[PDB]
Amino acid sequence: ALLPGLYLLPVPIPYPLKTVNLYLLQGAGEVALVDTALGTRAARGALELHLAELGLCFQDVKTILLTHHHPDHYGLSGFFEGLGARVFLHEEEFARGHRFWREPEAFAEASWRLFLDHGTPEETVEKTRERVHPPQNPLPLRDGEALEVAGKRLRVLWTPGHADGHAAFYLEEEGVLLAGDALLEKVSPNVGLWAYTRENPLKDFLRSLDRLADLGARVAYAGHFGPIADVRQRAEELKAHHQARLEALLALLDGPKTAWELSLHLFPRRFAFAETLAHLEYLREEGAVGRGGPPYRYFRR
């Protein structure tokens, strides 16, 4: 129990992060989940056992609050919805990451072309899609809106970057931030440029870190790894981290290079590619780099 009626629920995931952190809220006769893991036997089983420990079934969870559309957070939302749960998702996900799951053919060609144009040589995504149960009627959340959930009051903080409609949930009185993947303690959360992403995802991400830095939160519980005791400090560390990565990427451009080959050294794979692309497009917008093609080869001015 992180607070009375607020519980950390670690769930195994078949991705390099290995474990996703879900948050269970119980109170005032209500039960809610922040994030849902995904449809594997190991993930479903772990979540069931967690709920059982609290005396609950899947069917007891009537409210779902999603930080973002990534499979490790969004994967079981449609399952819970099928049992009668109400699913909440930030509005900016709807035409992007949410559409990606709902309409497999909406971004398919662009997704592959983005890889190919940026030097990727000739699916795990299909395996992922099989583990994802998209909600049919999710309700759009808005930045700054206030939710009364299980006796607690949560402020919706739109924090784009890691995902377009990424939302953190902030308990203002307690100063407790449910950060999702906008902030992590050990590594940087991915900032990837995908076919459905906003124009400059890294710029969004750094502005989101600024927003969280000035928030005044007393503690952050994120989507992965351990608790974050000093939120401003970690936000400032992730700022500095990406500044170092930008400098590192500039150094790697000793000649014209593709995003694929660059991603091997900037990250000594799919996520590495998208992150590298995000950093390149940030640099290009600033004018620090240019590109020929397609096939795109980036160079340092």
- Cite the annotated binding site for Zn(2+) by residue number: 68, 70, 72-73, 162, 181, 224
Q: Using CA atoms, how far apart are residues 213 and 298, in angstroms rounded to an integer?
A: 33
Residues 6+ apart with CB under 8 A from 231: 177, 179, 183, 212, 213, 215, 217, 218, 219, 220
Q: How many angstroms separate the first and last alpha carbons of the chain?
A: 53
CB under 5 A: which stretch of 71-79, 124-132, 168-176, 288-296 binds Zn ion?
71-79
Residue (78 or 223) nearer to Zn ion, CB? 223
Task: Please state the closest distance from residue 111 (CB atom) to Zn ion, in A.
Answer: 17
Neighbour count for residue 63 (Cβ, 10 Å): 18
Stretches 64-72, 112-120, 209-217, 280-288: which one binds Zn ion (CB under 5 A)? 64-72
Going by the DSSP 8-state scheme, the letter that residue 63 receives in this structure is E
Interface region with Zn ion, contact rule CB under 5 A, candidates 79-87, 174-182, 242-250, 293-301: 174-182
Comparing CB distances to Zn ion, the nearer of 72 and 92 is: 72
CA proximity to 190, closest of 242, 113, 243: 242
The amino acid at residue 182 is A
Using DSSP, state whether 294 is helix, strand or coil. Answer: coil
Nearer to Zn ion, 70 or 96 (CB): 70
Q: How far is the CB of 234 from Zn ion (least distance, A)?
A: 16
8 Å CB contact between 258 and 298: yes
Q: At what angle do helices 231-252 and 201-213 cross, to 10 degrees?
A: 150
User: Of all residues in this chain, which one has the CB nearest to Zn ion in the complex?
Assistant: 70
Chain residues 217-276 in contact with Zn ion, contact rule CB under 5 A: 223
Options 72, 92, 164, 204; binder of Zn ion; rule CB under 5 A? 72
Residue 21 host element (H or E): strand 19-27
- DSSP notation for 201-256: HHHHHHHHHHHHHTS--SEEEESSSS-BS-HHHHHHHHHHHHHHHHHHHHHH-SS-
| Edge-to-edge strand ranges of the sheet holding 6-12 | 6-12, 19-27, 30-34, 63-66, 86-90, 139-141
Interface residue with Zn ion, options 70, 131, 242, 257 (CB under 5 A): 70
In the complex, what is the shortest distance from the CB of residue 261 to Zn ion, in angstroms, rounded to a whole number? 25
**To the nearest whole angstrom, how small is the minimum distance from the Cβ of residue 220 to Zn ion?**
14
Residue ranges of the annotated binding site are: 68, 70, 72-73, 162, 181, 224
Instruction: Tell me how far, at minimum, the Cβ of 168 lies from Zn ion, in Å.
Output: 12
Residue 160 near Zn ion by CB under 5 A: no
Q: How far is the CB of 38 from Zn ion (least distance, A)?
A: 10
- Name the segment binding Zn ion (CB under 5 A); options: 1-9, 38-46, 57-65, 72-80: 72-80
CB of 293 to Zn ion, least distance (A): 30
**Binding letters toward Zn ion, positions 175-204, x by CB under 5 A:** ------x-----------------------
Can you give the binding site for Zn ion, defined by CB under 5 A? 70, 72, 181, 223
